[PDB]
Symmetry: D2
Subunit: 90 residues, 4 copies
């Protein structure tokens, strides 16, 4: 099996808010692999729900399985019950 | 940054031998995510140390970089054999 | 933060079944780091719940964070809600 | 096998300069797990060499095999040829 561990800073570009069965949850869009900066290749991004105590500007580690699924002719990449962790930064 | 850890078996179907700077060396192809479905799975490549035999199960771990046509390559990964027996029942 | 990914085979020495009010739970116990052959160090082992379908002989990857707890003189290392997936072996 | 992946910011308290045969290099020390709020337990710290371009204040991801080794009564936890990368912030 495959485990993917990403570190990224939560910001206005990579975050979104959805209304769920109970409350509002933030979702982050994180890269599934790396590329040459200024290169023409396409990086697949995965989604993961964030814990409620995380805010914009925080750096997080998102870690777990990723599953690719179809919605129409769009390909969704989703983390399946990942571990999400805040990184301490001063 | 992005670290990918994959455990897979080195079978003849996902392993090829290529000529390197110093001798014949094995390369393994490993999946980078899972599917439910008509999606295309991306596969990453990594060299295997000499002692690894076809049938061995290995863990490959490290950064995956997509290089320009695109290839997904592990950049100096950790590779370790997983010890597997047949069960007692 | 810290993510620990361990791959091990389920066998008689590392896996057990505990009867609970919710039925049979399967607990695996895996090494958190390695040691030299003929070393005095006592390796920490972390525990995690296996899914119902897993049997002895199966090879699994356990992945996530580990917490150290005090219990008498015994120290417990637990995976906190880890990802558990089965590796396919032929 | 076992892989540990840790993200930590490099500061004066977890980073030290040591002399090697290759010149002077920085080693970072990072916790290998967490502890419960009111528990009197010690956390193992893993060591890795930092690349020369990394600096105090940078956040870095270290990932790889961790090997414990003894010397007298002292116990070292060592990353074995880890992947070390910088995090953009």
């Amino acid at each position: 099996g495959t485990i993917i561990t990403v570190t990224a800073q939560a910001n206005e570009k990579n975050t979104r808010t959805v209304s769920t069965a109970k409350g509002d949850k933030k979702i982050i869009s994180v890269p599934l692999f790396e590329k040459e900066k200024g290169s023409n290749v396409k990086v697949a991004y995965g989604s993961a729900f964030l814990p409620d105590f995380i805010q914009l500007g925080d750096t997080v580690t998102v870690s777990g399985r990723v599953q690719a699924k179809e919605s129409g002719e769009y390909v969704n990449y989703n983390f399946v019950f990942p571990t999400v962790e805040k990184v301490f930064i001063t």
